[PDB]
Amino acid sequence: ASSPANKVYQDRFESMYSKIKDPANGYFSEQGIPYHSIETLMVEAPDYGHVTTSEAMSYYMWLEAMHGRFSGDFTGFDKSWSVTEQYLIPTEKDQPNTSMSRYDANKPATYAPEFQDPSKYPSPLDTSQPVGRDPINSQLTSAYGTSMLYGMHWILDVDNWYGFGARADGTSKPSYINTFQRGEQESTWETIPQPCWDEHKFGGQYGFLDLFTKDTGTPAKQFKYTNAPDADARAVQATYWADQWAKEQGKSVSTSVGKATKMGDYLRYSFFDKYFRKIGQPSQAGTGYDAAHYLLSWYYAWGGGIDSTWSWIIGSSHNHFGYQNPFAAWVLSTDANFKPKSSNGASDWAKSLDRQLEFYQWLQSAEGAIAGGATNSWNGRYEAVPSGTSTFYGMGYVENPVYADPGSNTWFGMQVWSMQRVAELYYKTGDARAKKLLDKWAKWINGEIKFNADGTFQIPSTIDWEGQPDTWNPTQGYTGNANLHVKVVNYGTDLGCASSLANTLTYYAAKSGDETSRQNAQKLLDAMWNNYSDSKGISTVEQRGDYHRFLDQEVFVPAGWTGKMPNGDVIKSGVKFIDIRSKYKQDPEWQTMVAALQAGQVPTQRLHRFWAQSEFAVANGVYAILFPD
Ligand SMILES: O=C[C@H](O)[C@@H](O)[C@H](O[C@@H]1O[C@H](CO)[C@@H](O)[C@H](O)[C@H]1O)[C@H](O)CO
Ligand SMILES: [Ca+2]
């Protein structure tokens, strides 16, 4: 039987759950897939509100699991995994085994450089450049009897708003699409949405392929998928709690635990350098695990031919602290129920856990906030690391990993999302490394939470950095990083980040006894509940400072290249963001947004982001369980 939970906060969870699953509120599509946000005029990570992400699915799993904990009904949780496997994990039709089985573990992919500006793309493929060996593919095909990968593609066009359809039919929904392809300077506003399954039916003469990659011959028809490691790890994290809570009530989610374990087995592809180069010696091709940094990199991707049989898989050289998940690693390496079927699954995750906690500590600033990360591929072309640059196992420190527009580590959210996982690990194991990290971090953030007299509040929103950490010496440990500093540029009231912050503080407080963390966590939850509720959950008015890019952001297109989006929009040099997404002009909020830009004002919105709403719900649940009195 489950332990008693605080009545007050349990009801707040059940209330939020009802608002989120309420058909009338519109958080889900008719197929049961959750949208990024109710509102459609949305550009921040995905560039359309009703486009979904693997991140949303993982939050959908977390939400339903907590629901199982209070209702004894886990059918919703099992349903979230069904929808996921059905719509976000490419099926046999989407990633044909005929092509995947032609994969060569000794030659995973063909090298192609990365550029610091979108106008340098397409990037030319170079077969002369070295590529290391894939050591885990044999383990996976052996344990699962297939060459297909079991991981979630990160972004989905739920209602086929772009018109690409399923496998080029132009009419089916949902639709597998991708956006980012051209380096650190390609913001959400500078992409060219493209289909994952490219049969050359849309876009240019060869689909969208020659916009990003330049080969010696004709681009072949091909499919490609990209994973968001932090999302798959969160799915494992959520499934673990669902399992625990189910067993406390004599119920079972056995089937879901299996899917999660398999997903976690495949997630190991994020442990490797993009083109499998040795960690700390990027000029050499790896011979196996000497190419594994054992951290959750920005992604891993795979693709293959549609008309001909061949395929490739790549990891990532860039590592951001915000993507790490020490808890998921603890689960997959120590819990017998989540032991991956592959020969080295559990042991690799054991190595990942230790490597991740070292990564966090190495990046902890003098104040307590965690710095960006590191890369094994300087400038994305395996260039010489500038002298004086600090390193972590041979990898150079990077302030804003992967993206610089805006800097990937200028958003406060990465702080709470990632530290919340450390807090869960600390709560469950009392691990000393986690404690040392949370004591300092929690003292920093507790001094940055501002409560106003009228009930509202503010927390860090945008942050900046100065300096770099001292080179990591495993046997030396944390030096204190006196020259690494964080600066809070501005504060705000982001309800998603505030909820995640509450979650983190609650787990930490429950284990450490730190009253300051507990009372701040409760004050946040109470403030949000009392002052920001609406019939759809919670919200607040926020400014959309980048929305002017809707009209003045030019999209780069290679000289001589012309194509059409499914709806007819012409793709050519000179086009702006809106020019290749003309349907946005039919959005209910379009006139209001444009009116504000004309009046020289900053547009404002009252948004209901799915992950934010779920974050608030879960935060209430966690508190009700850890502080039953
Ligand atoms: O870097 C700024 C952020 O992207 C903001 O636009 C926030 O959006 C969230 O950003 C994270 C990180 O990229 C996404 O994973 C998430 O889906 C976005 O909602 C925005 O202020 C809301 O928190
Ligand atoms: Ca840019």
XYZ file of C-alpha atoms and ligand atoms in Angstrom:
653
model
C 0.000 0.000 0.000
C 1.248 3.486 -0.875
C 2.217 5.831 1.961
C -0.190 8.643 2.960
C 0.110 11.825 0.889
C -0.641 15.454 1.767
C -4.331 15.963 0.927
C -4.009 19.630 -0.082
C -1.344 19.161 -2.756
C -2.734 15.841 -3.969
C -5.985 17.621 -4.845
C -4.046 20.312 -6.660
C -2.447 17.545 -8.713
C -5.776 15.865 -9.488
C -7.230 19.256 -10.468
C -4.384 19.991 -12.893
C -4.571 16.463 -14.287
C -8.254 17.024 -15.102
C -7.545 20.320 -16.804
C -4.764 18.753 -18.880
C -6.801 15.721 -19.987
C -9.978 17.775 -20.477
C -11.066 17.409 -24.152
C -12.442 20.956 -24.072
C -9.039 22.427 -23.202
C -7.348 21.037 -26.323
C -3.937 19.888 -25.032
C -4.117 16.747 -27.216
C -4.816 16.053 -30.890
C -7.572 13.658 -31.948
C -4.929 10.907 -32.057
C -4.075 11.372 -28.383
C -0.735 13.070 -29.005
C 0.050 16.078 -26.793
C 0.891 19.382 -28.498
C 3.801 21.622 -27.480
C 1.204 24.215 -26.467
C -2.514 24.892 -26.807
C -1.805 28.174 -28.605
C -0.681 27.732 -32.229
C 1.272 30.965 -32.793
C 4.368 29.509 -31.133
C 8.106 29.822 -31.922
C 10.881 29.007 -29.396
C 12.282 25.477 -29.938
C 9.738 24.052 -32.365
C 8.353 26.727 -34.750
C 4.635 25.908 -34.518
C 2.424 25.314 -31.491
C 0.787 22.104 -32.664
C 4.059 20.402 -33.510
C 5.097 17.983 -30.751
C 8.415 16.759 -29.323
C 9.803 13.668 -27.603
C 10.212 16.069 -24.676
C 6.423 16.445 -24.486
C 5.894 12.678 -24.628
C 8.284 12.158 -21.711
C 6.318 14.727 -19.698
C 3.124 12.940 -20.676
C 4.575 9.737 -19.202
C 5.610 11.516 -16.003
C 2.145 13.056 -15.672
C 0.298 9.740 -16.129
C 2.650 7.885 -13.758
C 1.928 10.380 -10.967
C -1.750 9.932 -11.793
C -1.286 6.206 -11.338
C 0.253 6.893 -7.928
C -2.901 8.625 -6.711
C -5.635 6.747 -8.547
C -4.336 3.196 -8.678
C -5.140 3.370 -12.395
C -2.061 2.913 -14.590
C -3.830 2.446 -17.926
C -3.081 6.071 -18.795
C 0.633 5.497 -18.310
C 0.558 2.389 -20.515
C -1.382 4.438 -23.072
C 1.332 7.121 -23.136
C 3.882 4.434 -24.064
C 1.574 3.050 -26.758
C 1.154 6.457 -28.378
C 4.901 7.029 -28.173
C 5.864 3.716 -29.782
C 3.175 4.180 -32.402
C 3.960 7.783 -33.384
C 7.451 8.891 -32.265
C 9.579 5.748 -32.547
C 9.998 5.051 -36.308
C 8.241 1.816 -37.272
C 9.488 -0.881 -39.639
C 7.923 1.150 -42.471
C 9.718 4.369 -41.469
C 13.178 2.875 -41.002
C 13.166 -0.239 -43.292
C 15.324 -3.055 -41.953
C 16.409 -3.783 -45.536
C 18.488 -0.605 -45.327
C 19.359 -0.703 -41.612
C 20.714 -4.269 -41.892
C 23.179 -3.029 -44.529
C 24.809 -0.905 -41.826
C 28.594 -1.330 -41.538
C 29.811 -1.098 -37.935
C 33.405 -0.518 -39.133
C 32.319 2.505 -41.216
C 29.314 4.070 -39.373
C 29.051 7.242 -41.447
C 30.820 9.599 -43.815
C 32.470 12.662 -42.299
C 31.029 16.101 -42.986
C 32.153 19.342 -41.305
C 30.077 21.773 -39.243
C 30.120 25.530 -39.910
C 29.570 28.526 -37.614
C 27.192 30.184 -40.097
C 24.234 28.822 -42.099
C 25.492 30.326 -45.371
C 28.374 27.843 -45.472
C 25.938 24.951 -45.910
C 25.575 22.539 -47.673
C 28.496 20.856 -45.892
C 30.617 18.686 -48.239
C 30.987 14.980 -47.418
C 34.588 13.750 -47.293
C 35.213 9.997 -47.456
C 38.947 10.511 -46.935
C 38.413 11.731 -43.369
C 38.692 9.053 -40.639
C 35.709 7.559 -38.860
C 35.979 5.145 -35.934
C 34.268 1.825 -35.201
C 30.826 1.288 -33.639
C 31.254 -1.113 -30.686
C 27.658 -1.490 -29.564
C 25.702 -2.279 -32.748
C 26.578 -5.989 -32.531
C 25.280 -6.054 -28.940
C 21.931 -4.542 -29.961
C 21.226 -6.526 -33.126
C 22.158 -9.615 -31.117
C 19.796 -8.941 -28.194
C 16.861 -7.608 -30.224
C 17.177 -9.441 -33.551
C 16.844 -6.334 -35.732
C 18.941 -3.451 -37.058
C 16.226 -0.856 -36.399
C 16.885 1.607 -33.592
C 14.443 1.989 -30.716
C 14.610 5.652 -29.730
C 12.270 8.623 -30.165
C 12.632 11.044 -33.080
C 12.549 14.462 -31.356
C 10.041 16.526 -33.321
C 6.699 15.679 -34.952
C 4.204 17.593 -37.143
C 1.107 16.260 -35.321
C -1.600 17.572 -37.645
C 0.451 17.695 -40.857
C 0.471 21.501 -40.822
C 3.466 21.610 -43.181
C 1.857 19.219 -45.664
C 4.665 16.672 -45.968
C 2.404 13.860 -44.767
C 3.556 10.342 -43.910
C 6.348 8.932 -46.078
C 5.645 11.566 -48.729
C 1.905 10.960 -49.206
C 1.306 14.604 -48.309
C -1.993 13.857 -46.551
C -1.448 11.521 -43.582
C -0.913 12.625 -39.976
C 1.202 12.683 -37.892
C 4.169 13.755 -40.031
C 7.843 13.085 -39.267
C 9.814 16.286 -39.851
C 13.058 17.886 -38.725
C 14.310 21.473 -38.587
C 17.810 22.257 -37.259
C 20.571 21.180 -39.660
C 22.951 24.106 -40.173
C 25.137 24.718 -37.112
C 25.242 26.862 -33.979
C 24.024 30.041 -35.664
C 20.879 28.518 -37.146
C 18.145 29.602 -34.742
C 14.546 28.367 -34.838
C 13.881 31.354 -37.116
C 16.517 30.445 -39.685
C 15.617 26.836 -40.488
C 13.881 25.288 -43.472
C 11.468 22.609 -42.186
C 12.097 19.361 -44.026
C 10.583 15.844 -44.010
C 12.399 12.910 -42.384
C 11.384 10.670 -45.290
C 12.647 12.435 -48.412
C 11.523 10.968 -51.734
C 12.246 14.204 -53.604
C 8.504 14.834 -53.897
C 8.714 18.174 -52.092
C 11.137 21.073 -52.001
C 13.717 21.169 -54.763
C 14.852 18.794 -57.487
C 16.357 16.492 -54.837
C 13.973 17.322 -52.030
C 15.693 19.261 -49.258
C 18.837 17.106 -49.187
C 21.262 19.327 -51.109
C 20.481 22.249 -48.818
C 22.423 20.505 -46.052
C 24.760 17.897 -47.533
C 26.807 17.958 -50.731
C 27.878 14.608 -52.183
C 29.935 13.640 -55.237
C 26.820 12.524 -57.073
C 23.035 12.750 -57.043
C 21.353 12.838 -53.624
C 19.634 9.476 -53.171
C 16.135 9.167 -51.742
C 16.605 8.720 -48.005
C 15.200 8.872 -44.493
C 16.901 10.259 -41.385
C 15.910 10.530 -37.722
C 17.337 12.514 -34.832
C 17.128 11.679 -31.152
C 16.915 14.089 -28.209
C 18.804 12.079 -25.516
C 17.496 14.117 -22.583
C 13.913 13.169 -23.511
C 14.542 9.428 -23.790
C 16.380 9.565 -20.473
C 13.408 11.339 -18.883
C 11.146 8.599 -20.240
C 13.300 6.059 -18.394
C 13.196 8.208 -15.276
C 9.397 8.453 -15.372
C 8.918 4.773 -16.086
C 10.996 3.867 -13.030
C 8.679 5.810 -10.716
C 5.637 4.322 -12.450
C 7.062 0.870 -11.709
C 7.781 1.714 -8.068
C 4.354 3.254 -7.467
C 2.608 0.397 -9.283
C 4.241 -2.247 -7.088
C 3.323 -0.349 -3.918
C -0.298 -0.946 -4.949
C -0.010 -4.489 -6.239
C -0.460 -3.247 -9.812
C 1.971 -3.721 -12.709
C 3.386 -1.850 -15.710
C 5.639 -4.701 -16.812
C 5.094 -4.056 -20.522
C 6.088 -0.382 -20.256
C 9.194 -1.189 -18.195
C 10.388 -3.350 -21.094
C 10.006 -0.587 -23.673
C 11.855 1.839 -21.411
C 14.724 -0.623 -20.831
C 15.084 -1.228 -24.564
C 15.022 2.546 -25.162
C 17.713 2.993 -22.531
C 19.814 0.294 -24.217
C 19.747 2.187 -27.520
C 20.225 5.537 -25.784
C 23.876 4.519 -25.343
C 24.516 5.740 -28.900
C 24.596 9.215 -27.350
C 27.682 8.101 -25.390
C 29.845 8.301 -28.527
C 31.693 10.944 -30.520
C 29.766 11.930 -33.684
C 32.090 10.112 -36.089
C 33.497 7.822 -33.412
C 36.823 9.655 -32.977
C 38.886 8.972 -29.829
C 37.894 11.149 -26.873
C 40.790 13.519 -26.182
C 42.475 12.820 -29.539
C 39.948 13.899 -32.226
C 42.392 13.393 -35.108
C 42.332 9.607 -34.690
C 39.603 7.110 -35.533
C 38.444 5.208 -32.473
C 38.743 1.446 -32.072
C 35.601 1.044 -30.010
C 34.884 2.397 -26.550
C 37.917 4.672 -26.671
C 35.429 6.860 -28.563
C 32.848 6.988 -25.768
C 32.660 10.040 -23.506
C 29.823 8.298 -21.641
C 27.758 11.473 -21.328
C 24.343 12.193 -22.849
C 25.369 14.201 -25.908
C 23.137 16.576 -27.845
C 21.871 13.678 -29.978
C 22.481 10.591 -32.060
C 21.018 10.188 -35.520
C 20.540 7.572 -38.184
C 19.240 7.265 -41.707
C 19.382 5.123 -44.804
C 18.326 4.752 -48.396
C 14.752 4.462 -49.562
C 15.429 3.317 -53.135
C 18.737 1.579 -52.328
C 20.032 -0.331 -49.292
C 22.593 1.415 -47.083
C 22.552 3.247 -43.747
C 24.478 5.288 -41.199
C 24.455 6.179 -37.494
C 26.179 9.070 -35.717
C 26.575 10.108 -32.120
C 27.465 13.644 -31.044
C 30.662 15.314 -29.875
C 28.890 18.097 -28.014
C 27.896 17.675 -24.392
C 25.643 20.014 -22.400
C 25.091 19.604 -18.643
C 21.391 20.295 -19.085
C 20.968 16.981 -20.930
C 22.527 14.740 -18.272
C 20.442 12.377 -16.146
C 22.329 10.656 -13.253
C 19.088 9.071 -12.021
C 18.256 7.291 -15.285
C 21.825 5.983 -15.287
C 21.472 4.780 -11.703
C 18.270 2.964 -12.664
C 19.560 1.216 -15.795
C 22.762 0.084 -14.058
C 21.575 -0.965 -10.605
C 17.910 -1.946 -10.806
C 17.430 -5.551 -11.947
C 14.030 -4.702 -13.457
C 15.606 -2.168 -15.814
C 18.646 -4.242 -16.767
C 19.157 -3.847 -20.544
C 19.162 -7.147 -22.464
C 22.416 -6.287 -24.274
C 25.663 -7.707 -22.908
C 27.148 -4.345 -21.871
C 24.041 -2.236 -21.283
C 24.104 -2.149 -17.487
C 27.883 -1.757 -17.231
C 28.070 1.115 -19.734
C 25.393 2.989 -17.818
C 27.399 2.344 -14.640
C 30.298 4.145 -16.299
C 27.952 6.890 -17.502
C 26.706 7.574 -13.966
C 30.233 8.160 -12.607
C 31.274 10.182 -15.639
C 28.150 12.360 -15.437
C 28.606 13.331 -11.775
C 32.196 14.308 -12.567
C 30.898 16.436 -15.447
C 28.486 18.338 -13.168
C 31.138 19.057 -10.556
C 33.678 20.211 -13.155
C 31.175 22.792 -14.421
C 30.003 24.106 -11.037
C 30.739 27.831 -10.852
C 32.126 29.735 -7.871
C 28.542 30.769 -7.082
C 26.951 27.347 -7.573
C 25.226 27.386 -10.980
C 26.381 24.795 -13.538
C 28.333 26.009 -16.575
C 27.685 24.901 -20.173
C 29.659 21.820 -21.155
C 32.377 20.476 -23.438
C 33.045 19.128 -26.923
C 35.377 16.603 -28.505
C 35.084 18.423 -31.838
C 36.270 22.033 -31.659
C 34.253 24.172 -34.071
C 32.584 20.935 -35.137
C 35.536 20.110 -37.389
C 37.868 18.439 -34.898
C 40.107 21.511 -34.848
C 42.932 22.180 -32.419
C 41.656 23.324 -29.035
C 42.846 26.913 -28.459
C 45.661 27.015 -25.902
C 44.562 28.006 -22.417
C 41.145 26.398 -22.859
C 40.170 24.153 -19.938
C 39.404 20.518 -20.660
C 37.461 17.555 -19.311
C 39.083 14.256 -20.331
C 40.600 15.956 -23.370
C 37.387 17.735 -24.341
C 37.373 21.517 -24.564
C 35.078 23.607 -22.405
C 32.310 25.393 -24.297
C 30.183 28.082 -22.692
C 27.154 27.545 -24.928
C 27.212 23.999 -26.392
C 25.710 23.451 -29.851
C 23.658 26.673 -30.124
C 24.626 30.339 -29.858
C 21.430 32.022 -31.071
C 20.443 32.226 -28.273
C 23.210 30.654 -26.192
C 22.066 27.173 -25.136
C 23.132 27.897 -21.568
C 21.619 31.380 -21.121
C 18.167 29.897 -20.316
C 17.731 29.307 -16.572
C 15.589 26.262 -17.309
C 18.596 24.006 -17.924
C 19.575 24.603 -14.290
C 16.417 23.132 -12.739
C 15.654 20.440 -15.326
C 19.079 18.853 -14.873
C 19.590 19.437 -11.123
C 16.139 17.939 -10.422
C 17.590 14.610 -11.605
C 20.565 14.996 -9.259
C 18.074 15.688 -6.442
C 16.155 12.500 -7.238
C 19.429 10.534 -7.188
C 20.419 12.126 -3.871
C 17.004 11.354 -2.376
C 17.195 7.671 -3.343
C 20.836 6.911 -2.586
C 22.156 9.669 -0.366
C 25.122 9.683 -2.769
C 27.892 11.994 -1.487
C 28.776 13.440 -4.901
C 25.178 14.532 -5.475
C 24.983 16.102 -2.012
C 28.128 18.175 -2.483
C 26.601 19.485 -5.730
C 23.134 20.279 -4.355
C 24.297 21.947 -1.138
C 26.131 24.614 -3.118
C 23.627 24.943 -5.996
C 20.591 25.095 -3.696
C 22.207 27.819 -1.594
C 22.797 29.852 -4.754
C 19.260 29.608 -6.169
C 17.603 30.077 -2.754
C 19.167 33.526 -2.723
C 17.743 34.386 -6.154
C 14.048 33.682 -5.519
C 12.082 36.898 -5.024
C 8.596 36.971 -3.504
C 6.518 40.145 -3.807
C 3.883 41.431 -1.366
C 1.011 41.084 -3.846
C 1.673 37.358 -4.057
C 3.661 37.252 -7.298
C 7.317 36.224 -7.603
C 10.399 36.166 -9.795
C 13.299 33.803 -10.415
C 16.337 33.991 -12.714
C 15.281 33.900 -16.367
C 18.309 34.719 -18.499
C 21.866 34.176 -17.259
C 25.376 34.955 -18.493
C 28.877 33.636 -17.819
C 32.457 34.733 -17.255
C 35.634 32.682 -17.254
C 35.961 28.916 -17.384
C 36.410 25.974 -14.989
C 39.859 24.677 -14.022
C 41.001 21.655 -16.046
C 39.490 18.544 -14.539
C 41.842 16.253 -12.648
C 39.868 13.152 -11.552
C 42.243 12.478 -8.683
C 42.185 16.140 -7.597
C 38.467 16.816 -7.769
C 36.585 20.083 -7.388
C 38.983 23.022 -7.053
C 36.162 25.490 -6.461
C 36.432 27.144 -9.888
C 37.108 30.641 -8.506
C 37.349 32.044 -12.041
C 34.015 30.689 -13.318
C 31.096 33.018 -12.633
C 27.391 33.158 -13.369
C 25.459 36.401 -13.730
C 21.685 36.791 -13.709
C 20.834 39.099 -16.624
C 17.102 39.339 -15.895
C 14.332 37.745 -13.832
C 10.878 36.587 -14.795
C 7.941 34.404 -13.897
C 8.320 31.345 -16.122
C 5.827 28.934 -14.542
C 7.513 25.873 -16.050
C 10.942 26.701 -14.664
C 9.405 27.701 -11.302
C 7.657 24.336 -11.061
C 10.829 22.430 -11.929
C 12.645 24.545 -9.308
C 10.045 23.576 -6.693
C 10.431 19.909 -7.632
C 14.218 20.087 -7.244
C 14.052 21.872 -3.877
C 11.436 19.469 -2.517
C 13.506 16.345 -3.222
C 16.613 18.019 -1.843
C 14.812 19.261 1.267
C 13.178 15.888 1.958
C 16.624 14.273 2.085
C 18.739 17.019 3.673
C 16.242 18.578 6.063
C 17.073 22.067 4.782
C 14.030 24.118 5.824
C 14.852 27.042 3.535
C 14.532 24.775 0.505
C 11.251 23.263 1.670
C 9.524 26.531 2.509
C 10.681 28.157 -0.723
C 9.422 25.142 -2.671
C 6.018 25.374 -0.968
C 5.768 29.149 -1.375
C 6.374 28.743 -5.118
C 3.669 26.091 -5.482
C 1.216 28.122 -3.399
C 1.952 31.372 -5.226
C 1.457 29.717 -8.622
C -1.757 28.005 -7.503
C -3.261 31.064 -5.821
C -2.243 33.772 -8.304
C -1.814 32.140 -11.714
C -4.630 29.636 -12.158
C -7.100 29.685 -15.049
C -9.608 27.171 -16.426
C -6.839 25.496 -18.447
C -4.202 25.155 -15.737
C -1.825 28.024 -15.051
C -0.492 30.901 -17.109
C 0.825 34.438 -17.065
C 1.414 37.168 -19.620
C 4.940 37.075 -21.024
C 6.797 39.097 -23.647
C 7.906 37.529 -26.933
C 10.968 39.643 -27.708
C 12.068 37.625 -30.733
C 8.732 37.687 -32.536
C 9.904 40.547 -34.748
C 12.002 37.872 -36.490
C 8.704 36.503 -37.833
C 8.961 39.313 -40.380
C 12.554 40.550 -40.525
C 14.513 37.294 -40.247
C 15.994 36.309 -43.588
C 16.357 32.579 -44.271
C 19.515 31.485 -46.080
C 19.093 29.585 -49.332
C 22.059 28.562 -51.562
C 22.593 30.511 -54.787
C 20.622 28.970 -57.645
C 18.485 26.760 -55.405
C 14.686 26.995 -55.748
C 11.940 24.780 -54.384
C 8.425 24.761 -52.989
C 6.929 23.869 -49.628
C 3.925 21.523 -49.893
C 1.499 24.481 -49.787
C 3.200 26.264 -52.683
C 5.422 28.788 -50.878
C 8.485 29.386 -53.027
C 11.851 28.693 -51.398
C 14.552 30.993 -52.794
C 17.223 33.454 -51.724
C 15.700 36.471 -50.013
C 12.756 34.778 -48.296
C 11.907 35.622 -44.691
C 10.658 33.332 -41.911
C 7.013 33.962 -42.758
C 7.575 33.549 -46.513
C 7.920 29.767 -46.247
C 5.160 29.422 -43.608
C 2.404 31.602 -45.137
C -0.341 29.589 -43.381
C 0.679 31.368 -40.158
C -1.231 34.367 -41.531
C -4.466 32.475 -40.890
C -3.642 31.987 -37.207
C -6.223 33.609 -34.879
C -3.429 35.554 -33.160
C -1.690 36.786 -36.337
C -3.391 40.201 -36.622
C -2.834 40.953 -32.934
C 0.863 40.083 -33.162
C 1.457 42.087 -36.360
C -0.525 45.035 -34.984
C 1.820 45.218 -31.992
C 4.970 45.064 -34.123
C 3.653 47.901 -36.288
C 2.911 50.020 -33.223
C 6.551 49.442 -32.329
C 5.661 47.359 -29.276
C 6.755 43.922 -28.069
C 4.124 41.220 -28.593
C 2.819 39.487 -25.479
C 1.239 36.076 -25.019
C -0.513 34.003 -22.378
C 0.755 30.524 -23.186
C -0.138 27.026 -22.014
C 2.942 24.896 -22.743
C 2.196 21.195 -22.177
C 5.482 20.461 -20.403
C 5.026 23.495 -18.148
C 1.520 22.446 -17.092
C 2.704 18.870 -16.425
C 5.740 20.205 -14.579
C 3.427 22.122 -12.229
C 1.194 19.101 -11.743
C 4.092 16.727 -11.000
C 5.666 19.278 -8.657
C 2.446 19.277 -6.604
C 2.447 15.470 -6.567
C 6.058 15.170 -5.470
C 5.466 17.601 -2.609
C 2.343 15.750 -1.481
C 4.354 12.520 -1.272
C 7.520 13.781 0.429
C 5.790 16.084 2.927
C 2.546 14.274 3.923
C 2.082 16.559 6.934
O 16.623 29.543 -24.720
C 15.349 30.126 -24.479
C 14.269 29.062 -24.364
O 14.243 28.299 -25.563
C 12.893 29.687 -24.125
O 12.313 30.037 -25.374
C 11.938 28.760 -23.364
O 11.503 27.684 -24.219
C 11.826 26.384 -23.855
O 13.196 26.149 -24.227
C 13.628 24.798 -23.966
C 15.114 24.733 -24.264
O 15.366 24.903 -25.653
C 12.809 23.820 -24.811
O 13.251 22.493 -24.580
C 11.333 23.954 -24.432
O 10.544 23.109 -25.260
C 10.884 25.414 -24.595
O 9.563 25.564 -24.091
C 10.717 29.573 -22.936
O 11.140 30.723 -22.219
C 9.747 28.767 -22.097
O 10.398 28.171 -20.988
Ca 21.713 33.295 -36.522
